[PDB]
Design a binder for these strands. Sequence first.
RNA 1: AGAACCUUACCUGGUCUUGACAUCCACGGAAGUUUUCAGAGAUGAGAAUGUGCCUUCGGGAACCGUGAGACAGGUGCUGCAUGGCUGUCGUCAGCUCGUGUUGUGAAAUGUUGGGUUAAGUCCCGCAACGAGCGCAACCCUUAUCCUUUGUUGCCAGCGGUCCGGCCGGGAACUCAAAGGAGACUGCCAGUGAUAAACUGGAGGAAGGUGGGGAUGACGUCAAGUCAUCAUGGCCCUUACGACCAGGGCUACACACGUGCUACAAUGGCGCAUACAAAGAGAAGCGACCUCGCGAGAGCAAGCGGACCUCAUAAAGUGCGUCGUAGUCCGGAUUGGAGUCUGCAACUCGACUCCAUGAAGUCGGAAUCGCUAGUAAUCGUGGAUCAGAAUGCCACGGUGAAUACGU
Lengths: 97, 95, 155, 210, 54, 100, 127, 82
Amino acid sequence: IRIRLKAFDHRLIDQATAEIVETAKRTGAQVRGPIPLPTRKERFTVLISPHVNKDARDQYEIRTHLRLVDIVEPTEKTVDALMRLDLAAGVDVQISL
Amino acid sequence: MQLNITGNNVEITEALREFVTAKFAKLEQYFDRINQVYVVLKVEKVTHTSDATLHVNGGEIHASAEGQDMYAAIDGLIDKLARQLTKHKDKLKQH
Amino acid sequence: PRRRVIGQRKILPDPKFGSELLAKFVNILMVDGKKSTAESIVYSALETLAQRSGKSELEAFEVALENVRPTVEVKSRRVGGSTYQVPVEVRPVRRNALAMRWIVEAARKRGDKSMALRLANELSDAAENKGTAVKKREDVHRMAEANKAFAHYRW
Amino acid sequence: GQKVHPNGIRLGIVKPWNSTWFANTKEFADNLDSDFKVRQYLTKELAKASVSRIVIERPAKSIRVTIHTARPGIVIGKKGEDVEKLRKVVADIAGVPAQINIAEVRKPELDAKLVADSITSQLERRVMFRRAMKRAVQNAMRLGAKGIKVEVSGRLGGAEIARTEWYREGRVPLHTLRADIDYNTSEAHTTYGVIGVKVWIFKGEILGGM
Amino acid sequence: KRQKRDRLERAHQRGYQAGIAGRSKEMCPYQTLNQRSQWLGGWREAMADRVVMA
Amino acid sequence: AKQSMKAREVKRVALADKYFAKRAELKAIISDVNASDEDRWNAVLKLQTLPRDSSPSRQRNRCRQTGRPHGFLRKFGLSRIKVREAAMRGEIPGLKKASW
Amino acid sequence: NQYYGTGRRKSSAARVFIKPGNGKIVINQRSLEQYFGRETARMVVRQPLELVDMVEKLDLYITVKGGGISGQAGAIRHGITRALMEYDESLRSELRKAGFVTRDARQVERKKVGLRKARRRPQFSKR
Amino acid sequence: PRSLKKGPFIDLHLLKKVEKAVESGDKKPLRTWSRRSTIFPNMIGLTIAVHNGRQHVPVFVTDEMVGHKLGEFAPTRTYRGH
RNA sequence: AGAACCUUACCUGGUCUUGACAUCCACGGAAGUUUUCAGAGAUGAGAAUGUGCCUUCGGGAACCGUGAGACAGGUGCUGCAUGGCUGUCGUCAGCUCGUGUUGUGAAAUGUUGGGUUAAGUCCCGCAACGAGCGCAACCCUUAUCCUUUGUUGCCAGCGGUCCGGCCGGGAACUCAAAGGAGACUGCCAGUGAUAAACUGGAGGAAGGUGGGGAUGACGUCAAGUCAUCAUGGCCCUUACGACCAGGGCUACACACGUGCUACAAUGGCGCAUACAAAGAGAAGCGACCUCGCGAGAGCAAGCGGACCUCAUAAAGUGCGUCGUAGUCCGGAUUGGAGUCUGCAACUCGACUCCAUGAAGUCGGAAUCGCUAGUAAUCGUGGAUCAGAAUGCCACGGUGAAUACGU
Ligand SMILES: [Mg+2]
Ligand SMILES: [Mg+2]
Ligand SMILES: [Mg+2]
Ligand SMILES: [Mg+2]
Ligand SMILES: [Mg+2]
Ligand SMILES: [Mg+2]
Ligand SMILES: [Mg+2]
Ligand SMILES: [Mg+2]
Ligand SMILES: [Mg+2]
Ligand SMILES: [Mg+2]
Ligand SMILES: [Mg+2]
Ligand SMILES: [Mg+2]
Ligand SMILES: [Mg+2]
Ligand SMILES: [Mg+2]
Ligand SMILES: [Mg+2]
Ligand SMILES: [Mg+2]
Ligand SMILES: [Mg+2]
Ligand SMILES: [Mg+2]
Ligand SMILES: [Mg+2]
Ligand SMILES: [Mg+2]
Ligand SMILES: [Mg+2]
Ligand SMILES: [Mg+2]
Ligand SMILES: [Mg+2]
Ligand SMILES: [Mg+2]
Ligand SMILES: [Mg+2]
Ligand SMILES: [Mg+2]
Ligand SMILES: [Mg+2]
Ligand SMILES: [Mg+2]
């Protein structure tokens, strides 16, 4: 089983990882290493004056962070627990068999 | 001397155009090498105003004047540029 | 500028003849960042310089260079209503830069077919005191000689 | 000249966001319009509850909304009659099951947004603008602000010409990024038109991103 | 642009220029005796040259 | 934006996604080379009949706060102005000033 | 017992392995003279060897990814000078004096708002 | 121009009211805002007064006018000179 | 940050009047759904079908239609009544306050003086003593190294191979991203007021603010915006409000500004062949296959993506040709023939093929940009967006010139 973790904060994500790679160890299973992935950086430019003045801008950004964790030898026990976990708000997870 | 007229809150009729052109024709005697020049006329509430900017041979001269009419505004303006143009000339013909 | 520019650059020497001098000469001919194109044009000229003088390349291209380097240039200085042309020594490195520039400038202003031909011919003519390049130096030198009286002003 | 929004600049460095969820483009614009509405509603009808901040999270097909106040009693009610009402009529517009919490603001005088309105209220009651401004800077420093600045601007005392006046005392270093400075504004609606108010409160410098 | 020019040389040429233009010694802006020596040094060299100029 | 202008956008959305299928399939035959000349010719008359405001190209993204028609951003559904205003409060998760 | 460097210039990265031998070179499963048309490139690649005359006393093996020609060529040189002063902690000082040991750093400047490029700014004629 | 496969475009309203012209022979001019519509062969012989923005203007259709689009015969700007 | 319609605020003509957009009240009718006709359409008149969910025996809850009037509505006016936001001098090194002292007083001192610095930077003096807003530092990025983790990324040593990281393996290396290490005038000479600093040297990936960004003092210009929004006042209310079709914003004797492409041989054309970065995609990015000279069409894998797709970088390089011509330079203009988006491309789209083949031979007076991975030059992506970049915002490739000096 693979779970991909994704979020806007980096401290926040490096929690959920540690949380999951604690349970996986708990409910007897081998977890194949939290491996980080390229972080997408959507960028935006906007006129900051409400009229005229083209050369006056802000440059905004959203950094998305991706993490991947595997499940080597999925115990029957684990599959329920790693499914049943209330996980920090503002974090998307995608467990997929 | 190539001219250009604007109106910011003023309709440029064909006195105010004809008038302004004649008044500006003098300035060349103060300095022969005037190039393109832009004029702007304003009316804000009660204040009549007239500014122009003059591209000259190695410079940029600007002034603005306020009248109770626009004619009196432009009359004032021409006296301001005259003095600046003479100052310019004299710090080139500086021997 | 008002302060001193710190940090001079590093010209790599030529791939062939391994000279920083010739490497500069390429840059000067180079256009729009096309260093390879210029690298070709230069060598093909020296070929055709070598193939007639029969006097090496890094030693022939030199002889052109000596016929054309100036030793005294004029600086302009506004005095009263007038402008004083005044003679000054030329720095060694500068007179290299000028020679190499005048050679290139003279080349381009010709009717020959290739660029390589123009350069070659010009370098050859240079070696026998002939082309526009060498004409220019002569003229420079004439002017500094004329208004020698203003040699020692510091103003 | 113009000045950067002191909250905005310090967002990652030393401040939090007010809304903290994650979404893909598909539902990103939709969570924004949803949030807007809930704030638009809450602030409207908690007007008189002294509310500082409405931080609002979307955990997993849901929404918990945790709304800072210096009068929690009035928000809660008689063992939570009003709170559940709010809950009922948020889930209404959030489009999902909602739950609500009540954070406690201990020192309302050291809260940029609270003090900002405090003034805006006084000004609405034809109070002298210098008195309002002067009072605030006292209160703040009295309770351990390391600094405080309040600006007010518009047609002060109904004057035919508009101007801008401000007092500071203590440190308010806007260029220092780790400096926790709390900033917020409030428009006041006198009969002469809008008087804008702005407030900066320095609480000291921080040594850790957290 | 990256680093300030020699202070002594500059001081010597400032001296020269006040010299030729005919200001008095005792306009010298330096009390740092080191720079001062450069300034006057220029100013006196310049006094020679003025003579043979018109 | 004038209340009216905000409104038209609702009239226009509603239709667009009610006749959505009718248009699609009624278009689908038009572009079918291998179909009855009788059919396709009918269709051309039939599409032009059902109402204009029911076309998706007829609508205009307006800020869903102020109604502005210009300087829209899809990611937020807001104008450049309101995006900035909200950005600075921290009402847009993640978003923040950027340097590189 | 093979000695290794990484090496970077502009956007290039060059992982290199040297071994004692007669003076072979491979870049990305290819020979020097093949991979690099330009002459400059070649000069640059071997000039650390040409310095400490091991031109034909060691046999090199390379791969590069990213950048253009003068980037890769440059990145390789750095790669060698790293390995070549690791096989021999001795040579450093000589290598260093040639200025091969430093990693260049010069990157392309970003485009900025209001400008046509990094520093080129749109015309306005006082004409 | 319109793809060949999609056939020639005419607004229906106008398409209809040049059956009654051609079947139930009339001899009146027809009003129309249908500047889109291309001229079909049926339209040969019938004046039809197409809108230009402020006024309708008569276009006595002919063989030569076939395929072109009505509005291609109702100029919409006035200019004499300067 | 993208006017065919829409947008749209304008013009012409056709309509509407408690109104297109709300709350309140009475009355009627579930809401929907499917049709014909007239009309440019708005709209008007018909026709079919339908009778729902808690309702405790009155139905309330929908959501629709008519009626009354408290009202809604206005991109109408004033940016010289305002808030908010923004340009500008200027990322210039300034601008001030408390107490003390001096002066009848406006004021002054501090903030001057000697040095120093990018810097009111720092030091030493001194009727000043202190403090604050700025300066610098804290933030992001880039340059080197180390730890942890290793798939969708990686292949040094092995073994196998359909020779394709392709396979078993490997966790080295490149790279991905969390956490750390590092640069401080710290170390060494010489100068210097036993200072502050300066100039040079060492090591080091980097040296003196390493490079680039973010960050804009008190104020100035009744600068800009009542058409983003809000808002004092004033004005309109069967019309300055509302709906619709067509047109207009794309008009052309002309003047000015910003760009693109050229005028050729450091080049045009044909064949052959190398090396990037950054970014986008959900009902979207759309391969492979078939069709077509081509724009494209049909069919339909994979991919919410370090995996799939956009999507083959170009200049470069080799071989050939053209031979200095208004040319095998240029590609404007125009005819013919198409494709695609879209109710719809006449006014007014982008692109394709065939034909056409203009001005232009390097630009008067004037005038602009740029000091290094910069200028110059070459390609790539994105936002807006049904379709509509030579603009804007980003990304790499190649890669100079010259600074004596004031
Ligand atoms: Mg992506
Ligand atoms: Mg007079
Ligand atoms: Mg700003
Ligand atoms: Mg409104
Ligand atoms: Mg549209
Ligand atoms: Mg611009
Ligand atoms: Mg570039
Ligand atoms: Mg229109
Ligand atoms: Mg009308
Ligand atoms: Mg103003
Ligand atoms: Mg105005
Ligand atoms: Mg006294
Ligand atoms: Mg001062
Ligand atoms: Mg003072
Ligand atoms: Mg003083
Ligand atoms: Mg001083
Ligand atoms: Mg200071
Ligand atoms: Mg050093
Ligand atoms: Mg700073
Ligand atoms: Mg004004
Ligand atoms: Mg219309
Ligand atoms: Mg226009
Ligand atoms: Mg160009
Ligand atoms: Mg051609
Ligand atoms: Mg796109
Ligand atoms: Mg084919
Ligand atoms: Mg500079
Ligand atoms: Mg380009």
